[PDB]
Write a protein that binds this ligand. Structure first.
Ligand SMILES: Cc1cc2nc3c(=O)[nH]c(=O)nc-3n(C[C@H](O)[C@H](O)[C@H](O)COP(=O)(O)O)c2cc1C
Ligand code: SF4
Ligand code: SF4
Ligand code: SF4
Ligand code: FES
Ligand code: FES
Lengths: 74, 156, 439, 227
């Protein structure tokens, strides 16, 4: 409910019993599945304003291209 | 690199004589550089800052604040058509469409050969004679879309 | 129509070939006699009293009294470095009067500088002129050179001992520079952000010194008052606004132009006598009394005198009294879209309501133009008009920006409602999340 | 002096403005452009209260509490409906162009703009148009620059130029394309440039050294220490 990227999800799976209590500490490779899970299309970085690879400034949703202050338009 | 000429520096100093603060000649120094070079390049900001004794951030803020100080390269002639309300009533849209069709550019852009740069401007104070358009030094009034090619031809 | 010096104190010495009147011709047509009388027989305080008693109001659009503005100057003799500034910016759309009065009668402006600077004890004067008035700048510089050659400017003017130097400062093309405190900031070579008041420019203005900013037309009204007296100026019109005013209609009329008329002249009188009415096949729809920053008025308001209180009580401002006539075929949404685009690009960016609320209105008006308006857009425009009023924003640019919008919404709401043609959608459906269906 | 806020009487210093006087008493007024050390300029228009002329006044007038002196016998209202609506409108206007960046923003959980968006009670977005964007500068090893998050409150330039005496950070541009930063890419030359990470109420100027090994403020173990 807290996740703003829909990254963390609770799956319909319950068989998680273990022999050692230390083996119930799941690291990132034990959690990161290879697909989108319950939310199949949401991409936070498609909405965020911060620039990453493949998505420059002004390429997010509802964003205009940046206008330089040196531009000739009034 | 950039270097102010002697004439530019003399004009800037003579403008500095007219005010009790040398900062007050920043607009006129930018306009002097713009008259001599068509626009204000990047080194001109630091040169004017060194002459006036004010930070380059202040000169850059003045240069980017005012619309008629060009911080990007322009063409040989700056077409400035009035897009304000009285010229809107008098139909500047025909003038803008004629200029776009003749020059094959969008407003704010420059032609391939650097001849004209198309810009909308504010009200030119000639509303009773609209639509008006100010090329480099001359204001042209009572404009019609069929008189645009005959008016642009005299500006080589 | 003939123009006698008694009823046309600003335009009687104009020439029929639209050529400037130089120093010899100006002196032949009763030139610098008000300046001579003021500088050879009058104290500065009694000149300020004469201006205040003549009821000279400001011609820049605010309509404030000039004598009361000059009376705000300090009485201390220690502050002797004082400045007179001329708002020759004239950047308001629909205004074309100061261009005429400076291209054709520059020595009237120079004489007004002389008298007003002597009255204010102002040692320096600057004409803050826009950079698009090349001919006006050339004529003003030539007039200043001629007056310096004749001994009317510089040191020891006419043997009085009053030293006054006059400069022409060409602007760099920004509308907000017309605001007087922003004019002071742009004169100092800064970004033309306006200043909060108090303190007024009369206490600490240009470079912290006492500084009075006046319009071109006010300083051109000054020499007639000093030459022909106070009771003559009070007896020009039988109205509460004394003196004459440069009025005129523009836009789709038969004879768009500028004429000097006494206050109290109705706008229908100007339209149907001097402008000649609308052109062929055009029905008169609306009119702005005082330029781009004034409320629209309908044809029912056309029978109204062009005074400050009469236009103000109708729900508008007199402004520069240069009216613009809008005919029937002009779409109100497109006109207000153009106006708001101007006002939102000529913002100075200082304060949040103008800077971030005028572009929102611009985008809403673009959507209403394209038929892509959504429900709640007109309510957003109305709330913007209520929240950009006087005192909400840092200067008076945004109230003058929202006056045409609210007036066009008041009188032409059907077109704005006709702009709304699609349902309100702010979100998109995310696959996996059920939306909160608000009612 | 004596001020009457929402029908309650308080004794405040008369040399203070209304915003700092009411904040000293514990009254919550949102503010962006004002800072205690920088003075009052009245830019952001966020500190609006309703000032009445006297006790038996009903209309009032919206004023900026940072620009209004705390004179004797001053009647104001903070929680009036018109003042609350105007303050929420100012927050909304700041939110129209603000990027969708809080998860990936170093000021998240530490952001004055977040706190004032929540405090004015603005949580429903009805703006549907494009947001203006900006390109960032490289300000050196210490200060990271992200101009999208700017609310144009002029705190950075006022501190860096008027207070700190620096010369290489200004405001450039116009109407709503105002930009804050250096005239070119380069290191900020002030010895006190790092105070921008706390002067800026948004995530424009952030601690790059903290950003390389980042955690939120609620995860920090703090202590009072001496440099
Ligand atoms: C946004 C704005 C633009 C203005 N532009 C001008 C202008 O272009 N010319 C002018 O004379 N006054 C302009 N004014 C009015 C001035 O603030 C001031 O009232 C005037 O220049 C001098 O006052 P006066 O009428 O007593 O002479 C403008 C005011 C505002 C708020
Ligand atoms: S209303 Fe505000 S942002 Fe707009 S021009 Fe005036 S001070 Fe500048
Ligand atoms: S500056 Fe504040 S409101 Fe903006 S993205 Fe960062 S945390 Fe969110
Ligand atoms: S960069 Fe930060 S401190 Fe500067 S104006 Fe923008 S929000 Fe304010
Ligand atoms: S509206 Fe175009 S010249 Fe004034
Ligand atoms: S805090 Fe008062 S207007 Fe910004």
């Amino acid at each position: 409910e807290a996740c703003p990227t829909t990254a963390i999800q609770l799956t319909p799976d319950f068989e998680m019993g273990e022999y050692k209590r230390q083996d119930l500490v799941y690291e990132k490779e034990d959690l990161l599945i290879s697909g989108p899970g319950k939310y199949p299309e949401y991409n936070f970085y498609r909405m965020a304003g911060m620039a990453i690879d493949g998505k420059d400034k002004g390429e997010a949703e509802n964003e205009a291209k940046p206008i330089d202050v040196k531009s000739l338009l009034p | 690199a950039f270097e102010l000429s002697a004439a530019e520096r003399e004009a800037i100093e003579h403008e500095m004589h007219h005010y009790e603060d040398p900062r007050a000649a920043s607009i006129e120094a930018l306009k002097i550089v713009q008259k001599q070079r068509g626009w204000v390049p990047d080194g001109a900001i630091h040169a004017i800052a060194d002459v006036l004794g004010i930070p380059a951030s202040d000169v850059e803020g003045v240069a980017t604040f005012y619309s008629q100080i060009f911080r990007q390269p322009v063409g040989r002639h700056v077409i400035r058509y009035c897009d304000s309300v009285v010229c809107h009533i008098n139909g500047y849209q025909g003038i803008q469409a004629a200029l776009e069709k003749k020059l094959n550019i969008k407003p704010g852009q420059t032609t391939f050969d650097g001849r004209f740069t198309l810009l909308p401007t504010c009200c030119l104070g000639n509303c009773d004679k609209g639509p008006n358009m100010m090329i480099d030094e001359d204001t042209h009034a009572h404009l019609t879309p069929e008189a645009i090619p005959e008016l642009l031809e005299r500006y080589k | 129509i003939i123009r006698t010096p008694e009823t046309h104190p600003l335009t009687w010495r104009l020439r029929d070939d639209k050529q400037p009147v130089w120093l010899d011709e100006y002196r032949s047509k009763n030139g610098y006699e008000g300046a001579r009388k003021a500088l050879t027989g009058l104290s500065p305080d009694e000149i300020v009293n004469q201006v205040k008693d003549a009821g000279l109001k400001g011609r820049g659009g605010a309509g404030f009294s000039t004598g009361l503005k000059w009376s705000l100057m300090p009485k201390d003799e220690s502050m002797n470095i004082r400045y007179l500034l001329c708002n020759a910016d004239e950047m308001e759309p629909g205004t074309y009067k100061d261009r005429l009065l400076m291209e054709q009668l520059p020595h009237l402006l120079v004489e007004g500088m002389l008298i007003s600077a002597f009255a204010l004890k102002a040692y320096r004067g600057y004409i803050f002129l826009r950079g698009e008035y090349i001919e006006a700048a050339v004529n003003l510089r030539r007039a200043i050179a001629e007056a310096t050659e004749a001994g009317l400017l510089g040191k020891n003017i006419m043997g009085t001992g009053f030293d006054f130097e006059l400069f022409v400062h060409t602007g760099a093309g920004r509308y907000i520079c017309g605001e007087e405190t922003a004019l002071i900031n742009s004169l100092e070579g800064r970004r033309a952000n306006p200043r909060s008041k108090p303190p007024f420019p009369a206490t600490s203005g240009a470079w912290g010194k006492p500084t009075c900013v006046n319009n071109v037309e006010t300083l051109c009204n000054v020499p007639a008052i000093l030459a022909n007296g106070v009771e003559w100026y009070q007896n020009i019109s039988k109205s509460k606004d004394a003196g004459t005013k440069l009025m005129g209609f523009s836009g789709r009329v038969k004879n768009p132009g500028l004429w000097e008329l006494p206050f109290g002249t109705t706008a229908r009188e100007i339209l149907e006598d001097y402008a000649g009415g609308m052109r062929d096949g055009l029905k008169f729809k609306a009119w702005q009394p005082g330029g781009a920053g004034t409320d629209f008025l309908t044809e029912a308001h056309l029978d109204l005198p062009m005074e400050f209180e009469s236009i103000g009580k109708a729900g508008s401002r007199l402004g520069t009294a240069l009216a613009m006539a809008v005919d029937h075929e002009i779409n109100m949404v497109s006109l207000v879209r153009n106006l708001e685009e101007f006002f939102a690009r000529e913002s100075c960016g200082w304060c949040t309501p103008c800077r971030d609320g005028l572009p929102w209105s611009v985008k809403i008006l673009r959507a209403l133009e394209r038929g892509e308006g959504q429900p709640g857009d007109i309510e957003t425009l109305e709330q913007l008009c209520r929240f950009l009023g006087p005192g909400k924003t840092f200067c008076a640019h945004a109230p003058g920006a929202v006056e045409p919008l609210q007036s066009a919404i008041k009188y032409f709401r059907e077109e704005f409602e006709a702009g709304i043609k699609q349902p309100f959608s702010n979100t998109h459906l995310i696959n996996g999340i059920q939306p909160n269906l608000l009612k | 002096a004596t001020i009457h806020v929402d029908g309650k009487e308080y004794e405040v210093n008369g040399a203070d403005n209304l915003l700092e006087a009411c904040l000293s008493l514990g009254l919550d007024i949102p503010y962006f452009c004002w800072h205690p050390a920088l003075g009052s300029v009245g830019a952001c228009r966020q500190c609006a209260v309703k000032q009445y002329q006297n006790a038996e006044d009903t209309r009032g007038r919206l004023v900026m509490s940072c620009m209004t002196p705390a004179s004797d016998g001053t009647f104001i209202s903070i929680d009036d409906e018109e003042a609350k609506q105007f303050r929420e409108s100012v927050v909304e206007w700041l939110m129209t162009n603000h990027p969708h960046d809080c998860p990936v923003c170093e000021e998240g959980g530490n952001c004055h703009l977040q706190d004032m968006t929540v405090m004015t009670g603005h949580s429903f977005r009805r703006y549907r148009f494009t947001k203006r964007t900006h390109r960032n500068q490289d300000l050196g090893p210490f200060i990271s620059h992200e101009m999208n998050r700017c609310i144009a409150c002029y705190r950075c330039v006022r501190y860096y130029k008027d207070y700190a005496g620096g010369t290489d950070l200004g405001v450039y541009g116009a109407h709503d394309n105002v930009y804050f930063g250096r005239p070119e890419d380069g290191t900020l030359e002030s010895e006190f440039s790092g105070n921008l990470v706390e002067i800026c109420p948004t995530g424009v100027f952030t601690d790059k050294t903290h950003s390389e090994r980042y955690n939120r403020k609620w995860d920090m173990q703090f202590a009072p220490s001496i440099c």
